[PDB]
């Protein structure tokens, strides 16, 4: 009496099955005259023994292996103790007797031939309990059906899940590692993470407890390139960003309690949950390596009102999110790149000679200032271009005036800079006292001794707060660079082509894809005087008359982002 085609099938009939001749095994409780009774149980290693009923075709191992591949791995789930409790209140001037029994999950394996099941193997997996109550006056005779069950029954809800046994977003992130928290509440499909179901009768209350009697827990890992993103590697980067210490253990308890009304019974289903972390490697506007790590969480609870067969096929393997939408992006230091430290706080002017130990390879310079202010950071001949990051939560705990306190923090936040190493530019950024900062020097090639120059620019240049000025020289025009995120500013400095304060020419400035409002300043050689304001660049046709031979700086924000790169015309 089956519709499926000839062949083998694995079937899950759902939780909430009670065996026969097992009703009053655990005993009962008696309340009276409004007394309140609570009966609970724990399932750890002895009341968690699965019951097999195989056939000559399907042995115990065959039944076990197939089911655990598609449904919850009961072998590793029965190892973790789980508790369940029930509560009933007797009415006034009456007595109440309530007895408890276990509930099992019924997994079948069948062989269909000519639209008729010709074989069946049945496995009962201990899941949770169930309480049956009755108000009895003394001396009354009860029906035997209440005490004795002579046939297995489905009480939670009829279910039938069958399996045949086959033989575009714009992300303006700079190049580097990132760890993204995609949210909590993830659960695997096909009830592969179901702690269990529990049926609370009318007027009663029920509860499911993870008492954490055992620290053991099961994370999950899925990489795209195990060469770089290993399991031990991803877990190390998580500790860098979010300071996650416990992966395979846990000491947090979670309970789920439901107090059903006096009209209808209710079903409460408890699943284990995971928090999803994504470790990516962003490069030139494209992910090249991604690893998903699912860390165990504190469960999820679903309440359903109990209500034919509705044969259904198992859902495709995957995850489902039940928690709120979340996306937290945190940069991380690449462990491969070395980390040089500057021990002396920068006061007003510093010259840094890049050590030879770097061996012409990219690395990080860790530094901090001796006094808050706006600083200009550049390099000899303004090449190569630099990137600057700010450590998250630095200079909050340990402070030593003058010297540097290396917090060893690796959760960095991008500020500004260009990943292109062939361009020439410098940075003007607002740095704060007692805050660790990183500068990522890229892979230089020339053996010529490079130098990093810091200056405390207290003049008109402060108008360029947190801006990567790019020296667009050689003008005599389509210059493209990495587009800053929304509300971030990028500046271009250029000298107009026999300066005599009289010769002048028309210049056209417009942005191909991204619209932004920018201002143009005229250099004094030092002092900047505004020459415009609120100059939209969304393919504007406006032209500005400027004297030849005068150095100007045009700073543009990012009003709206629609392309990874930013292109300027001159």
């Amino acid at each position: 009496t089956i519709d499926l085609a000839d062949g083998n099938y694995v079937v899950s009939r759902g939780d909430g099955w009670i065996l026969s001749r097992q009703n009053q095994i655990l005993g009962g409780s008696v309340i009276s005259n409004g007394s309140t009774g609570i009966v609970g149980d724990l399932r750890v290693n002895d009341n968690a023994i699965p019951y097999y009923y195989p056939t000559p075709s399907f042995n115990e191992e065959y039944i076990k292996n197939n089911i655990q591949t598609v449904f919850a791995n009961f072998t590793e789930a029965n190892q973790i103790p789980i508790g369940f409790e029930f509560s009933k209140t007797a009415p006034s001037n009456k007595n109440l007797y309530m007895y408890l029994q276990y509930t099992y999950i019924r997994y079948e394996i069948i062989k269909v031939l000519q639209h008729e099941i010709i074989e069946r193997a049945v496995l009962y997996v201990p899941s949770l309990g169930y309480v049956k109550s009755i108000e009895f006056n003394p001396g009354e005779k009860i029906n035997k059906d209440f005490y004795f069950l002579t046939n297995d029954k489905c009480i939670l809800n009829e279910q039938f899940l069958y399996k045949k046994i086959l033989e575009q977003r714009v992300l303006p992130y700079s190049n580097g590692l990132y760890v993204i928290n995609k949210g909590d509440g993830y659960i695997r499909t096909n009830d592969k993470d179901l702690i269990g179901t529990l049926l609370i009768e009318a007027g009663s209350s029920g509860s499911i407890i993870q008492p954490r009697l055992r620290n053991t827990t099961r994370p999950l890992f899925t990489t795209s390139n195990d060469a770089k993103f290993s399991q031990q590697y991803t877990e190390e980067r998580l500790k860098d960003a979010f300071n996650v210490q416990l992966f395979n253990t846990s000491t947090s308890l979670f309970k789920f309690v439901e107090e059903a009304p006096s009209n209808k019974n209710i079903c409460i289903k408890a699943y284990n949950t995971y928090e999803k972390y994504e470790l990516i490697d962003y490069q030139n506007g494209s992910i090249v390596n991604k690893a998903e790590y699912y860390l165990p969480s504190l469960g999820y609870c679903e309440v359903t009102n109990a209500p034919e067969v509705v044969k259904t096929q198992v859902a495709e393997d995957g995850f489902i999110q039940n928690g709120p939408e979340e996306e937290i992006v945190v940069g991380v230091i690449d462990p491969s790149e070395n980390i040089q430290e500057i021990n002396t706080a920068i006061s007003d002017n510093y010259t840094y000679n890049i050590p030879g130990i770097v061996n012409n390879n990219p690395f990080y310079i860790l530094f901090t200032v001796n006094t808050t202010g706006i600083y200009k950071i550049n390099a000899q001949n303004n090449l190569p271009s630099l990137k600057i990051y700010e450590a998250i939560g630095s200079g909050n705990r340990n402070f030593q005036s003058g010297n540097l306190c290396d917090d060893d923090i690796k959760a960095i936040n991008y500020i500004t800079g260009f990943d292109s190493p062939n361009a020439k530019s410098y940075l003007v950024v607002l740095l704060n006292k007692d805050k660790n900062y990183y500068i990522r020097v890229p892979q230089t090639s020339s053996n010529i001794e490079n130098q990093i120059k810091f200056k405390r620019e207290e003049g008109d240049l402060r108008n360029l707060m947190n801006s990567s000025v790019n020296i667009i020289d050689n003008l005599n025009h389509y210059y493209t660079r990495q587009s800053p995120d929304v509300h971030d500013y990028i500046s271009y400095e250029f000298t107009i082509p026999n300066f005599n304060n009289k010769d002048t020419s028309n210049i056209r400035l417009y942005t191909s894809y991204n619209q932004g409002i920018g201002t143009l300043f005229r250099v004094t050689e030092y002092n900047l005087i505004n020459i415009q304001q609120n100059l939209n660049l969304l393919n504007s046709t406006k032209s500005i008359r400027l004297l030849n031979g005068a150095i100007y700086i045009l700073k543009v924000e990012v009003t709206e982002l629609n392309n990874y790169n930013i292109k300027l015309h001159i």
């Binding site: 070395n338 980390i339 030879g356 130990i357 061996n359």
Partner: protein, 173 residues
């Protein structure tokens, strides 16, 4: 000895052992670690003969990637021990780069000692190159060894005794 990944010092690791097929054979690899090289300091004597003689002044360089770095030492250190400073070839007033090779043991041996000197004509000894350990075994220069070598009889098990292994047709992986 293996050059540190980040710091300009040489970390001390443990030699590998044969674990391939046979329990009847056991040995530890030798062709591992940084490849060192002895360079004549003054190039005064004839270049025809390249054999190293006792009490010669030398540079103890080592190949890192395609470059040839040199072993230096701090000119002034308070504590008895001090980690060596492996860095590219250069000239500076903050480090000594002159090493003398000595053979203190009178009995036959293939070991040798390396001493740091301020200058060829200077009579002030800096210390002897060696390894010590509080775990964290380190490739250091110690002034203590200067005395231990003179305590007759010479202790062949000291940490200042060194031997050089070139590739030879008679030894294989």
């Amino acid at each position: 000895i293996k050059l540190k990944k980040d710091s300009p010092v040489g970390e001390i690791l443990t030699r590998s052992k044969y674990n391939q097929n046979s329990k009847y054979i056991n040995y530890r690899d030798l062709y591992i670690g940084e490849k060192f090289i002895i360079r004549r300091k003054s190039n005064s004597q004839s270049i025809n003969d390249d054999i190293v003689r006792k009490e010669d002044y030398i540079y103890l360089d080592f190949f890192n990637l395609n470059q040839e770095w040199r072993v230096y030492t701090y000119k002034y250190f308070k504590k008895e021990e001090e980690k060596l400073f492996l860095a590219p070839i250069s000239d500076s007033d903050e480090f000594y780069n002159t090493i003398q090779i000595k053979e203190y043991d009178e009995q036959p041996t293939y070991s040798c000692q390396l001493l740091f000197k301020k200058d060829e004509e200077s009579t002030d000894e800096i210390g002897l190159i060696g390894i010590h350990r509080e775990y964290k075994d380190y490739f250091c220069i110690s002034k203590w060894y200067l005395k231990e070598v003179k305590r007759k009889p010479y202790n062949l098990k000291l940490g200042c005794n060194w031997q050089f292994i070139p590739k030879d047709e008679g030894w294989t992986e």
